[PDB]
Structure formats: structure tokens, C-alpha cells
Amino acid sequence: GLMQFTLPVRLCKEIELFHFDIGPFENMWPGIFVYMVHRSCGTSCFELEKLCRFIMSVKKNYRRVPYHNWKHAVTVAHCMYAILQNNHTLFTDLERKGLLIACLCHDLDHRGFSNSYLQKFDHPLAALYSTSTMEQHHFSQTVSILQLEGHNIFSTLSSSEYEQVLEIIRKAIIATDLALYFGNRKQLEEMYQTGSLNLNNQSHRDRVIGLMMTACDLCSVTKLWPVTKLTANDIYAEFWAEGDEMKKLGIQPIPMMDRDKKDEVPQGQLGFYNAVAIPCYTTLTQILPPTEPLLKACRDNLSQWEKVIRGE
Numbered sequence: 001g002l003m004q005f006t007l008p009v010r011l012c013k014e015i016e017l018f019h020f021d022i023g024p025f026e027n028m029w030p031g032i033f034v035y036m037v038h039r040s041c042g043t044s045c046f047e048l049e050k051l052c053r054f055i056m057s058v059k060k061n062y063r064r065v066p067y068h069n070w071k072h073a074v075t076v077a078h079c080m081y082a083i084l085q086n087n088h089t090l091f092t093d094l095e096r097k098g099l100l101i102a103c104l105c106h107d108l109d110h111r112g113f114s115n116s117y118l119q120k121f122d123h124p125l126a127a128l129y130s131t132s133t134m135e136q137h138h139f140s141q142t143v144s145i146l147q148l149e150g151h152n153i154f155s156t157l158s159s160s161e162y163e164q165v166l167e168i169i170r171k172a173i174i175a176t177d178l179a180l181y182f183g184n185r186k187q188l189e190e191m192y193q194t195g196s197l198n199l200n201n202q203s204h205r206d207r208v209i210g211l212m213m214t215a216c217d218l219c220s221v222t223k224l225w226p227v228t229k230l231t232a233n234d235i236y237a238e239f240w241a242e243g244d245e246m247k248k249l250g251i252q253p254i255p256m257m258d259r260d261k262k263d264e265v266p267q268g269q270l271g272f273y274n275a276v277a278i279p280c281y282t283t284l285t286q287i288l289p290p291t292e293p294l295l296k297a298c299r300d301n302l303s304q305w306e307k308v309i310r311g312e
């Protein structure tokens, strides 16, 4: 049914926008991804039967957790689409192929627990993955689906370009570990301020792509206020579920994961915007000027949380 799916003409104009919310169109998400692939890469860059088989298998490998779910995957993929479409020339055909697949697969098989939980509580996954625990597992899940019968969408590529594309994917998924973002953004800010940033430099390229992955991962802060607030509910519901497990183990979780400290959510968001989000989209807008609407919408939601704090 996915190969026969067609996108409504009204969605065609609105999908191009940075602030587009996929929320209301759940039944259309697989077809929306296909549409986005064809517009960014071309109508023939993947075999349609293999692509539709890959997408539905990716969908199946997302769990029914409050936040890191199938919806989040498509939301991140859409924000990447808008970035790629507004900056199409700066990126190669292979980068466009890998980054959209990576965004859809970046949280594959997420359990709803942070990398800290798995490490501190000696979860099997943290045994084989030292740093960026879940992120390395997400890439491992992506390869596993690719290596299934009739799912290998890169099979028509040469062995040179096959190993090239999954390196883009690997680096992109690992970059979604927020722990690595803070250092990455500082370096990119430095490279820009000194006027020494170069897109032909491959280490610079992986870093810009890295910041792009974060920008897409956090893009719920770039939607219209009501969507932004509603997503926050899903985020904390997952955090609080992790905090409850720590409480059953006797340990008090950090206030972010403590449902009894939910009064400090507005100030918690305020902190997240000023320390994480605003800096992320500021540096991205500097490097890629067409991405400005992301920073504009993030600033608008910042003042909204400021408006929440002062009881307005």
C-alpha cells in the first residue's frame, strides 16, 4: 500500500516549511518519508519496493515509548529534509541519501532509558558500548535491517560507495548523542569566528553534519508553541518513567527525571534553551543562513517559557 500512496497536494507546500508538524498525519508518515526522499534525492535513487520494505521494518523496530518512538524518527527526518532542501548544493547525492536514512534510524530500538542509566546499572548494552551507548546500538540496528532480505537500499551502489554511505550514517547517528554536541558546537563556533571553516575540509564536514543532526534531534523546540508544549509532555513522561525505576532501586534521580519536581519544568526548559537549543541554532544559522527560521522559532518558544515562569 506504500508504493501506491500519494501525498495530498495541500501537504506538498507545507512540508517544505521548517515548522511543519507531522503530528496530525500519522497514517501518512511512511509516505511522507518516501515523498521527502524523492524530492531530495530524485524519483529513482532507491528501488521503490526495497525502500518501502526498509521503511516499514524501521517502523517496526521502534518501541511504544512516550518520546523516542516512530513519530520522533519521522520528525527528525523531516527537519533534515528542510535543511537539505534549503542548502541542497552544499551536500553530495550520497550525503542526502545517508542523512535522511540516518535521521529515520537514529533512535532505532530505543528503550526509554538514558546512556547514564545503562552504564550505572550495568545493562548488557553498556558492556559492549563504552561511550554513546544507545547511539552505537542504533547504528547496529540500522545495519541489521539493511542486511535483511530485500531491504538493502544501497545494494545497487559500488562497494566503495556502500562503505562510504554507512560511514556518513554511523557518524550522523553517533552525533545525536547530546554529550558530544557541546564540544562540537564550541569548535564550530571557533572555526566560524576565526573565518577558518571550510566545507571542503572533511573533518569540518562531519562536524557541520553533526550539528545538523543535533538541530534536527531537538527540533521540537522549533515548532509552534502548542506543538512544542505538547511534545514536552511526551519527553518528561519518558524521563519520569526512568526516574521511577531509580527510586525503586532506592536512588533519587536527577530533578529532570523526578516527577515530584515537575514545578521546575519551566525553569528546566528555560535552562535547556539558553544552554543547549539557542546556541545550537545560532551556530547553525551562522554556517547555514537559510536555517534561520529554526532559530527564530526556538527564540519564540524561549520567550513562551519565559512567559510561563512569570505567570502570564
Ligand SMILES: Cc1cccn2nc(CCc3nc(-c4ccccc4)cn3C)nc12
Residues within 6 Å of the ligand: 217, 218, 220, 221, 232, 235, 255, 256, 261, 262, 263, 264, 265, 267, 268, 269, 271, 272
Ligand atoms: C525540548 C527538548 C528536546 C530534546 C531534549 N530535551 N530534554 C529536555 C529536558 C529539559 C530539562 N528539564 C529539566 C528539569 C529540571 C528540574 C525539574 C524539571 C525539569 C532540566 N532540563 C535540562 N527537553 C528537551
Ligand SMILES: [Mg+2]
Residues within 6 Å of the ligand: 106, 107, 134, 176, 177
Ligand atoms: Mg537518541
Ligand SMILES: [Zn+2]
Residues within 6 Å of the ligand: 068, 072, 076, 106, 107, 176, 217
Ligand atoms: Zn532522537
